[PDB]
Amino acid sequence: SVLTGDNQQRGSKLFKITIALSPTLAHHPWPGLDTHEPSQSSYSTIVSLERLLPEMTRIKRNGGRILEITEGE
Amino acid sequence: MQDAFTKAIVAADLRGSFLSEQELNQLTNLVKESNKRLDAVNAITGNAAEIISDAAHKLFAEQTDLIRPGGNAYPNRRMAACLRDMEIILRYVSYALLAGDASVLEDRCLNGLKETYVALGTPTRSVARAVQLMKETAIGYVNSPSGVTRGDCSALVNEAATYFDKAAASIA
């Protein structure tokens, strides 16, 4: 997701993170086995350095792995 | 408590005004029906015992478990209560019918009845059922008397219904 402007209000250096998505990370609210969205198997988000460690750890424990990290600017 | 007349007053009071002529005409006509109204009440009271007796029989024929050990109408002690309650509800309904207003029934009897029943483990549904059974029987009398001047009581009959139903609903 290309940042239109600095997403976060609170300010630090921001880094774009592209992740391969497990069904768990974004389960659809559907009956049966939850499916992540087809259109994005690789969600990309913008994160502040402070949040970067929590975001990565949560991504890690869920199936999906970091495809790439890029500084948001 | 409250009734049709008093009510209209109170409304008028908050507006701070004399009664509207329109409003008088509600009361004027209400008076005219009195005689019918009265007979209706008289019919219930006259048949009271029966109404209940009847309803009960039917209630227990339907929900046989209530009267089996472990049910809520067993043993005698409980049964007695259940009968007593039915009656009360009836009494209040009649009162309302005379007043020409739900209030008396709701404030004295219905407000909190559900919760009581719940706490005890009385099945509210069955209670409601009973109330209806009563309703039908009661109307039966109201609507089919002998030696009264023949005429149309529908208006009253329906209002009666409503009262019964408010009861059924709030209990249920």
Binding site: - | M1, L27, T28, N42, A48, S94
Partner: protein, 162 residues
């Protein structure tokens, strides 16, 4: 609120008993009366204003000094109040006629009457005149039972005030 109908219900309710013939007889009494009562109310309601003017006025004739400066009757605010008040009395009376009991009167006017009047130094006397003057006027527009009813209620207040 005390009306015939409410009372019999109440009495029946206390004893825990169905409304039997006893009470209905009573009810029948009310509602029979209503026709007269209702008539009276229509009459008062219509002439309200005129009755009020006349009354307020009267009071001043009866108690000239009230209109002098430094008194209660003096300065418009007070006059306005004076009017308002009497209006009320009247209003309620009509109500009571229609309700078929003193109920409305008791709860609005009478309960707490004394203390209010004491704390604000309203002299019962005044009100009374107002009423009397009214009673006198009403004694023309009405007749027979309608009249009788009107009086009863008007008086009821006189007695409560005094």
């Amino acid at each position: 609120m005390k009306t015939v109908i409410t009372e019999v219900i109440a009495s029946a309710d206390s004893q825990g008993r169905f409304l039997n013939n006893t009470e209905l007889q009573a009810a029948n009494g009310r509602f029979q009366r209503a026709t007269a009562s209702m008539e009276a109310a229509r009459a008062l309601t219509s002439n309200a204003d005129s009755l009020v003017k006349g009354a307020v006025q009267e009071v001043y004739n009866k108690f000239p000094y009230l209109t002098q400066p430094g008194q209660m009757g003096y300065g418009d605010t007070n006059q306005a109040k004076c009017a308002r008040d009497i209006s009320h009395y009247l209003r309620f009376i009509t109500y009571s006629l229609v309700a078929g009991g003193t109920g409305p009167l008791d709860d609005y006017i009478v309960a707490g009457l004394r203390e209010v009047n004491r704390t604000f130094n309203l002299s019962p006397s005044w009100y009374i005149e107002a009423l009397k003057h009214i009673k006198g006027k009403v004694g023309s527009q009405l007749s027979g039972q309608p009249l009788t009813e009107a009086n009863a209620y008007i008086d009821y207040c006189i007695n409560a005030l005094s």
